[PDB]
Design a protein around this ligand. Sequence first.
Ligand SMILES: *[C@@H]1O[C@H](CO)[C@@H](O[C@@H]2O[C@H](CO)[C@@H](O)[C@H](O)[C@H]2NC(C)=O)[C@H](O)[C@H]1NC(C)=O
Length: 246
Amino acid sequence: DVSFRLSGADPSSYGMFIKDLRNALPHTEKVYNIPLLLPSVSGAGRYLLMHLFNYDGNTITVAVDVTNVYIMGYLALTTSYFFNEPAADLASQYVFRSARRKITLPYSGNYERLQIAAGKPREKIPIGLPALDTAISTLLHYDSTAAAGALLVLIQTTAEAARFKYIEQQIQERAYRDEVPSSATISLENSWSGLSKQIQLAQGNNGVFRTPTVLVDSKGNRVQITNVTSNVVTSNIQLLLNTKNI
Ligand SMILES: *[C@@H]1O[C@H](CO)[C@@H](O[C@@H]2O[C@H](CO)[C@@H](O)[C@H](O)[C@H]2NC(C)=O)[C@H](O)[C@H]1NC(C)=O
């Protein structure tokens, strides 16, 4: 398991948590020096538990699929919650079985569905460490519309930062003041599968992507990424989605 406390949190302690989160995910191989997540993991070992504490010391435990970094559901006090999708229903066979009741959220965990449920795109939802504290707090008591926005904050501040050093740094910049994600952040989120696939197809193609990936840069300028020498591959991405899952 890995844990993070919002009480006394700062950039350094958040960076330790994102470190712990990356290092909890198993890999047997690196591709261009980036850990390659596993094609599959059988049984309960396919879920990592993240214990999150709000500033008041209240806590939820979040289940994360190690193969993909997808959040499946979470436990808050004696109630478990899971997205409405087959992968989450499977997870519910393995984690938080001791919950007195299990509520299936009324949406799946994907960004499109979550934004619809929340009523706003994530371009418009501030993120940062205060937003994470609020999200933990929201999830402690069931409210499906409030929870969809809390989960957009949670997914970005924990999974997405583990995937990209740039996103981790964005959240560190927002340790004491939230701010909507940069358009570079959103682009990276939306490109993780595509980047993960192209980095792996480069292995037998001399470092060159089979199909270029388009990203927004820190300047808000669209860029083409065409090979593994890009700063996106050498510096920024931290985990690859296995192409067996793409
Ligand atoms: C591999 O990617 C690099 C970019 O990371 C390409 O070089 C850049 O692209 C053009 C020049 O061709 C310029 O706009 C950039 O300033 C270049 N940057 C650097 C640091 O060289 C390169 O062309 C790509 N190589 C292949 C084989 O696709």
